[PDB]
Assembly symmetry: C2
Homo-oligomer: 220 residues x 2
Amino acid sequence: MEPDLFYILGNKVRRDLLSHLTCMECYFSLLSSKVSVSSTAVAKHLKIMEREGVLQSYEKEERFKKYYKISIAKSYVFTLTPEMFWYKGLDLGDELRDFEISLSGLDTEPSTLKEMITDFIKANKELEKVLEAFKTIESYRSSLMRKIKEAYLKEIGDMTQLAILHYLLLNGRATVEELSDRLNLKEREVREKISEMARFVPVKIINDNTVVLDEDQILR
Amino acid sequence: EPDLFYILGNKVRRDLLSHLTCMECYFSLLSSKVSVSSTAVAKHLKIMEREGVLQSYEKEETKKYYKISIAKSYVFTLTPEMFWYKGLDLGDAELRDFEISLSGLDTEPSTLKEMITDFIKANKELEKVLEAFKTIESYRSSLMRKIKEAYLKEIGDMTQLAILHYLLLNGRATVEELSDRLNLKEREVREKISEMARFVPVKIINDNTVVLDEDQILR
């Protein structure tokens, strides 16, 4: 009945692997240069992920490697405070919709237990809408990312420019040093890749070392 | 800094944490169906303290209890095309409506330019979702605090409170599931539900599944 994504994602070598296995075309190795770890410690991890049904292996065979694929498409949500702990997984797949999350005029000062319970359940209903909108946006983004990966490949051809784009689209911010680390390239090459890439994608550098997508130029 | 995946990736740590979220409500930190040494339990608690999820306190007259040191919500995604996560700090909720404009977002873009434009559009709606997520969770957390205090002074029956707490966060529970969580017999659990029924609209469906009567609570 389930893969424990928490346990999988709890080790940082597995995170790194997954963040490389996610842009398969884009990287030479599945590991960042600094995450220095042996095999079969890396192989230990891959096997752990195969066993959990997270990853699937292939032999890429010809006439006269192991590869891996990600077996799941899921979004997760969780909360930890002193008053509550809960989590929920969401199956991605689909339906564009104009959600409204109606938080204004949820009661802020209930007098009685009866009121508070009513108020809690009304909040639960707006929470459902949040989760539904989160499910929708993530199904959309994942579909689109696959298109972006193919469109960058054909339209431009550079694995490693795509790798950078991929990261920024998912995370917004990246230092030259962090990109250098995960790409196992030197800082000098990363910076030139960014300038080569700026010819196709509005990309700029801020504070001398921080790579960000130019969102002003992308919308208008 | 604290690695919640690592914390949450163990079954006892989860069981421990869900008991620690209603600390007055339970007489023990563990469910009945789980047999773990005591000394593993003390190890798990220590791991959570090192990570900065827990803070422990000492009492004299020597007893040790535990408090949760974080108030955070999290989001993550894994598909063949992406893996990312985001921790959200909870606190002073500012209530206000959010509109997530998702049509059209375009299901058929032609150029990389369009696709990139489309992705940043989608990212802007995502930022509204995560903020709304942050808002309802601050709200729900504050309200649980109040509900626990209200239940304490107004009616006083811990275990009745654990059941409500459970039911508010999760849709429903079986008598067996509750029995496991509370370390009680199913009979005692059924007794607590009907006692509670006078203060909280709670229906029992199909002889075993306990749910909050939403039609009665809302209308």
